[PDB]
Design an enzyme around this catalytic site. Structure first.
Site, short mmCIF file in Angstrom:
data_model
loop_
_atom_site.label_atom_id
_atom_site.label_comp_id
_atom_site.label_asym_id
_atom_site.label_seq_id
_atom_site.Cartn_x
_atom_site.Cartn_y
_atom_site.Cartn_z
CG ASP A 1 10.17 -20.28 11.92
OD1 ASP A 1 11.13 -20.56 11.14
OD2 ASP A 1 9.06 -19.82 11.54
CG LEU B 30 7.80 -4.39 18.25
CD1 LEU B 30 7.97 -5.86 18.50
CD2 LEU B 30 8.85 -3.67 19.04
CG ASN C 220 9.78 -15.54 12.29
OD1 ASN C 220 9.10 -14.96 11.42
ND2 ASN C 220 9.86 -16.85 12.34
CB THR D 271 0.84 -19.10 10.43
OG1 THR D 271 0.37 -20.44 10.33
CG2 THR D 271 0.32 -18.47 11.72
#
Lengths: 297, 261
Positions: free
Chosen positions: A128, A84, A133, A15
């Site tokens: 979301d 990660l 994600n 985003t």
């Protein structure tokens, strides 16, 4: 400000813009840096960032991505996250010819539910949840990430943004355009993700809103009042909807034992009120033999 | 039903109670502000109420904004000429946090009558974020009220409106309301709305939920009772006008009870 960080590679965008993997030159820590442009003459700090930073500062849990720091300039915001290895979508794609072991599926689902239950307990909707994600490490852990579209809720819930959650992972309450939605929408998405971990294909890959509903109905059976009271009074409900029967989960998710089928079905109940909670799911018989295996990477 | 998050109400409540302590402004920061006063702040909040009604904002947004202002002013000295800039910046942040469709930044520069430039508003935005360290998800009176309402049987909209009304009146007067936690003011506003409309008191079920008894709520109810009685004569009137309208059932027009056991 960013003097102690050395960029290593672009690890993707998002985003706010580019997300870089970086290294603390002094401590050796590897991080993800989210750079957010500040609109210093126009709109100021984005709501998306105000929500992500404020909510992540509250949520400290092993299964939620850790926000480590927030570095200010006059012109930019840098968000320093734990690093990660990759996300669940990339992992699934990479596992196309090896499959994913069931103990690892169960482990990941169990952990996702622990993270989610933690959000819900702390009045935060994620809104979301999708593979892209969810971030995994090399040690068997998985964590909710990208709280960009999250929202602190009150009790009872009130009307929030309708344009929420990527279409494939979107709960039928949102699709039918209901006044109010709650924690249940997050459980739906996880249900879709459970399915997808087992088959490595999305459960409901809609091309459109009408198409998404039809795909859900084709599989779970077209809802009526007995299954879901008040469904036929929903704003976007249509009495012309074809009446499809439910498909046996033995065809929907063949690899899945009787426990998984049971938990999957409670996670995909039509009625948001009857859909299982993250707390409840954590007690399901599916998890009695849960372990924490490492992925093959 | 899941809209009332039954599997989570207790955890949520327990967390908001711990959080309302960490988001708590310093009581009597006002004495430590050389150039600003409770009266000035009353004017500020009253103005934010109007802004709230003109931009059709959520009540929750107005409550967040005041939290932000009070915490900011617990940390930074602010001259009277800049008081409004703080207030405008805090409503912008509240709106961005809470509103589906926040007003644009331009709209916030217009309500100050071009007292300030857009750049001041955005710079103050950043400063407020730094001072609060992005801790913006503050528990409000409203977050406790909506929860306390669920203990009604049945729901009475006039009780709900009236408790909302009394809740906002408290925003105005830092003396005495800065000494009371949101969950306390909430509880007192609900008992008092209930008493006024039904004749009933604070329920056992909420005693069990909150730990608060009428004894422990007495100080706050004495203050709040007095604020309600004096509201007609308060220098700031925006909340009374707001709550005369049909939308809130006309509750500000109700006669407060002369006394309470």
């Amino acid at each position: 400000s960013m003097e102690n960080f050395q960029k290593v590679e672009k690890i993707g965008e998002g985003t706010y813009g580019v997300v870089y993997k970086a290294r603390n030159k002094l401590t050796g820590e590897v991080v993800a840096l989210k750079k957010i442009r500040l609109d210093t003459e126009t709109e100021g700090v984005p709501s998306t960032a105000i929500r992500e930073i404020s909510l992540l500062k509250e949520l400290n849990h092993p299964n939620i991505v850790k926000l480590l720091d927030v570095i200010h300039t006059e012109n930019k915001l840098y968000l320093v996250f734990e690093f990660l290895h990759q996300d669940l979508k990339k992992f699934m794609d990479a596992s196309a010819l090896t499959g994913i072991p069931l103990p690892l599926i169960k482990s990941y689902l169990f952990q996702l539910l622990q993270g989610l239950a933690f959000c819900h307990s702390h009045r935060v909707l994620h809104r979301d949840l999708k593979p892209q994600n969810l971030l995994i490490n090399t040690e068997g852990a998985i964590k909710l990430a990208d709280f960009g579209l999250a929202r602190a809720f009150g009790v009872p819930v009130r009307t929030y943004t309708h344009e929420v959650v990527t279409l494939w992972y979107r709960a039928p309450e949102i699709l039918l355009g209901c006044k109010y939605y709650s924690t249940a929408v997050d459980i739906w998405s996880l249900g879709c993700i459970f399915a997808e971990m087992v088959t490595r294909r999305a459960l409901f890959p809609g091309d459109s809103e009408i198409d998404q509903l039809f795909r859900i109905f084709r599989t779970l059976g077209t809802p009526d009042e007995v299954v879901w009271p008040g469904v036929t009074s929903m704003p976007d409900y249509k009495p012309s909807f074809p009446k499809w029967a439910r498909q046996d989960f033995s065809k929907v998710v063949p690899p899945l034992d009787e426990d998984g089928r049971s938990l999957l079905s409670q996670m995909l109940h039509y009625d948001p009120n009857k859909r299982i909670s993250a707390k409840a799911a954590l007690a399901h018989p599916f998890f009695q033999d849960v372990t924490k295996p490492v992925p093959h990477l | 039903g899941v809209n009332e998050v039954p599997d989570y109400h207790e955890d949520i409540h327990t967390y908001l109670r711990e959080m309302e302590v960490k988001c708590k402004p310093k009581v009597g920061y006002m004495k430590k502000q050389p150039d600003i006063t409770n009266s000035m702040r009353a004017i500020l909040v009253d103005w934010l109420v109007e802004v709230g009604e003109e931009y059709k904002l959520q009540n929750e947004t107005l409550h967040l904004a005041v939290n932000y202002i009070d915490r900011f002013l617990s940390s930074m000295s602010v001259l009277r000429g800049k008081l409004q800039l703080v207030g405008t910046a805090a409503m912008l942040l509240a709106s961005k946090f809470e509103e589906i469709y926040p007003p644009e930044v331009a709209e916030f520069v217009y309500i100050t009558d071009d007292t300030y430039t857009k750049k001041q508003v955005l710079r103050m935005e950043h400063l407020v974020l730094k001072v609060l360290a992005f801790d913006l998800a503050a528990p409000t009176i409203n977050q406790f009220l909506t929860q306390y309402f669920l203990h009604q049987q049945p729901a009475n909209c006039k009780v709900e409106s009236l408790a909302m009304f009394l809740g906002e009146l408290s925003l105005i007067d830092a003396d005495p309301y800065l000494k009371y936690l949101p969950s306390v003011i909430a509880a007192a506003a609900f008992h008092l709305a209930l008493y006024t409309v039904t004749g009933q008191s604070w329920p056992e079920s909420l005693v069990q939920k909150t730990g608060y008894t009428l004894e422990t709520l007495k100080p706050c109810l004495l203050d709040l009772h007095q604020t309600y009685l004096r509201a007609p004569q308060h220098a700031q009137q925006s909340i009374r006008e707001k709550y005369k309208n049909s939308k809130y059932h006309g509750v500000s027009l109700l006669n407060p009870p002369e006394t309470l056991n």
